[PDB]
Amino acid sequence: MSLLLTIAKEYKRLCQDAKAAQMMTVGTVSNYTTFKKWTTSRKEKNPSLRMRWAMSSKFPIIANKRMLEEAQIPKEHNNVALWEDTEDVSKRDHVLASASCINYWNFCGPCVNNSEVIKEVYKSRFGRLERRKEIMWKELRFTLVDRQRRRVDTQPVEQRLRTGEIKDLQMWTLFEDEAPLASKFILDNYGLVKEMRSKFANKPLNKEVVAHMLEKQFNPESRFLPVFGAIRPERMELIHALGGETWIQEANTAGISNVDQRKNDIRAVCRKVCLAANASIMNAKSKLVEYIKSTSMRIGETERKLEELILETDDVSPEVTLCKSALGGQLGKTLSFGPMLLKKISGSGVKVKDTVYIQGVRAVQFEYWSEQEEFYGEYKSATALFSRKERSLEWITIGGGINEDRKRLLAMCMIFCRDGDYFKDAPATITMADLSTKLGREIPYQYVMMNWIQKSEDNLEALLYSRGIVETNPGKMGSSMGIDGSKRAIKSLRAVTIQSGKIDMPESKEKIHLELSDNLEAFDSSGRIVATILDLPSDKKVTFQDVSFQHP
């Protein structure tokens, strides 16, 4: 309106100048950003001392002038100075104001109709508050804690997104007139935008604040922290008030935020479709991609496309990995050998060939890597740090808490390194039928021995016996492991070390673009396999809720 006319007059006056005209004529609009930095540049070393010295004065702040006149704010109530007509050097349109002036406005001043919109602006923190209120605390106890360090998420968030998918969302909800062309994420997620738009429409608000808060509402704060017990964002957000190195405030927090259910459902669906595509023989790749794009699922209220969620999550499972590989989705450098987890710390190598006789004389090729390499390994409630050297398990240390898990981790590690004579001369029990090719698809001897172990516990015991056994020397009694998985014995296994206290999970902020074969085995710029279809459960029946398998 008249304001518009004033803006036009100001633009004219400014163009009358030569420098302003040259700068508003030359280059594109992006230059604005640059211009935004050369101005209003001033910092301070110790704002604390400066703040105290500054607030000590009798009119320490700045403030708008017209807003005060319109707000009928006077310069006294019962003799206390509230502001004085004057001009700051930087703004030139602001006036120095007292600390007492703020108090004046809140107690008696310009009232507004409603302000519950705040609860939506800062929804994450009100959610924190509510989650806290729904807790039932328990006793407090003192003891030592096995706090393992690792990367986790501390902010529970639904529909975790990227940054490019946000810079647009912050516009269609607030600045639609200045909106860019419609991106695919919008056309796909229409109801979401409509919802976010219904609340922040026809309201008096500061919009920059809203955008910042939305960024926080869609950001999972990832941190590398010490942790104990279960791993859930609902806990990590207040871990500071659950336990430390010497104390623990017990409390039950299981029935809140319903997060991991979504992840387990996603992984179940991934397993299902992977098996389905595996049923094929020559196009499992395209079959799987079709099953992907021909599928959707519900999240709370909204319906999301599977391939979109898969590229947003970070579940390092042998199922999600395959899918993210088919869609060309980059991912981290994390391995998977059956149920266990693995990660390489250092070393190198290259493939090499060797053979073994299954029964009598039956040559079967099996491969193994060359030079020394370190690895961290993580099984259920058990950690390990080991080294492989030329088809042998050089050393290993463990910091778990269970005997069964310890033994299973040790056995799977021995397999992963092809250590022992079994890989030199397989046992009689195995045969050519159990070898491979359920229907033609071969199987390396590794997973063969894997299932052979999972079949019977005695296979596992024999495999462990394949590792050298000796008498527990003195002193090392504590750092020793028997066959049952006991922290000490009179005779223990060879080249083993035990200890109380898990191992600190390594970290690396790296990404890699891998591929896969027609047999559903991914490769990473080398002959190494990060995932497959033999490292996942065989099969199981489940009834998926709120899903759409729009495929014949």
Query: Under the rule (CB under 7 A), what is the footprint of RNA?
Result: 56, 58
Beta carbon of residue 299, minimum distance to RNA (angstroms, whole number)? 52
* Residue in 85, 246, 353, 433 binding another protein, rule: CB under 8 A: 246
H or E segment to which residue 388 belongs: strand 382-388
The answer to whether residue 18 forms part of the interface with another protein (CB under 8 A) is yes
Q: Does 260 bind another protein (CB under 8 A)?
A: no
| Inter-axis angle of helices 284-293 and 260-278, nearest 10 | 140
**422: phi then psi, degrees, rounded to nearest 5:** -55, -45
Residue 502's beta-bridge partner residues? Answer: none
- Residues in 59-88 that interact with another protein by CB under 8 A: 59-64, 67-68, 71, 77-78, 80, 88
CB of 60 to another protein, least distance (A): 6
Binding residue for another protein, selected from 84, 87, 140, 222, defined by CB under 8 A:
140
CA 117 to chain centre: 30
Neighbours of 536 (CB within 10 A): 20
Partner whose footprint covers residue 48, from RNA, another protein, none (CB < 5 to 8 Å by kind): another protein
Which entry of another protein, RNA, none binds 202, CB below 5 to 8 A by partner kind? none
How far are the Cα atoms of 24, 288, 322, 513 from residue 330, in angstroms, in the given order? Answer: 42, 18, 11, 5
Candidate list 136, 279, 282, 490; residue touching another protein; CB under 8 A: 136
Choose the stretch contacting another protein; rule: CB under 8 A; options: 117-125, 274-282, 450-458, 486-494.
Answer: 117-125
- Closest to 129 in 3D by CA, of 159, 161, 158, 156: 156
CB of 81 to RNA, least distance (A): 8
From the list 206-214, 316-324, 415-423, 480-488, the region that binds another protein by CB under 8 A is: 206-214
Is residue 119 near another protein by the rule CB under 8 A?
yes
3-state secondary structure at position 547: strand
Region of 50-58, 314-322, 335-343, 361-369 interacting with another protein (CB under 8 A): 50-58
DSSP states of 59-116 as a string?
A: S-EEEESHHHHHTT--S-SSS---B-S---TTTSSEEEE-SHHHHHHHHSS---S--T
Question: Which residue, 56 or 261, has its beta carbon nearer to RNA?
Answer: 56
Q: Which partner from the list RNA, another protein, none does 348 bind, CB cut-off 5 to 8 Å by kind?
A: another protein
Report phi then psi at 53, rounded to 5.
-60, -45
Cα 48 to chain center, whole Å?
36
Q: Which of residues 428-467 bind another protein (CB under 8 A)?
A: none
Question: CA–CA separation, 539 vs 545, rounded Å?
Answer: 19
State in angstroms the smallest separation of the CB of 400 from another protein. 13
Residue 84 vs 507, nearer CB to RNA? 84
Tell the smallest beta-carbon distance from residue 87 to RNA (Å).
Answer: 12
For 262, 268, 317, 374, the CA distances from 543, given in Å and listed in that order, are 14, 10, 21, 42
The encoded tokens of residue 291 equal 């099953």
| Residue 93 C-beta: closest distance to RNA, Å | 19
Asked if 26 touches another protein (CB under 8 A), the answer is: yes
Residue 105 sits in the site that holds another protein (CB under 8 A): yes
What are the structure tokens assigned to 136, written together?
């039932």
Q: Min. distance of Cβ 182 from another protein in angstroms?
A: 4
Nearer to another protein, 164 or 440 (CB): 164
Least distance (Å) between residue 57 CB and RNA: 8
Span from 4-12, 274-282, 449-457, 483-491 in contact with another protein (CB under 8 A): 4-12
With CB under 5 to 8 Å by kind, the binding choice for 26 among another protein, RNA, none is another protein
Tell me if 228 contacts another protein by CB under 8 A.
Answer: no
Please give the torsion angle defined by the CA atoms of residues 504, 508, 513 and 519, in that order, rounded to the nearest 10 degrees: -10
Least Cα distance to 325 among 536, 549, 538, 519 occurs for 519
Which is nearer to RNA, 102 or 193 (by Cβ)?
A: 102
Two tokens at 229?
């017990």
- Phi and psi dihedrals of 444, rounded to 5? -65, 150
Q: Within 476-535, which residues bind another protein (CB under 8 A)?
A: 497, 499, 503-509, 511, 513
Residues 156-175 that bind another protein (CB under 8 A): 164, 167, 170-172, 174-175
Would you call 137 helix, strand, or coil by DSSP?
A: strand
In 209-294, DSSP assigns E strands to 222-227, 247-252
CB atoms near residue 414 (< 10 Å): 24
List all residues 6 or more positions away from 280 whose beta carbon is below 8 Å from its beta carbon: 287
Under the binding rule (CB under 8 A), the answer on residue 24 touching another protein is yes
> 532 with 539: CB under 8 angstroms?
no
Shortest Cβ 415–another protein spacing (Å): 20
Of the candidate residues 186, 269, 530, 531, the single one contacting another protein (CB under 8 A): 186
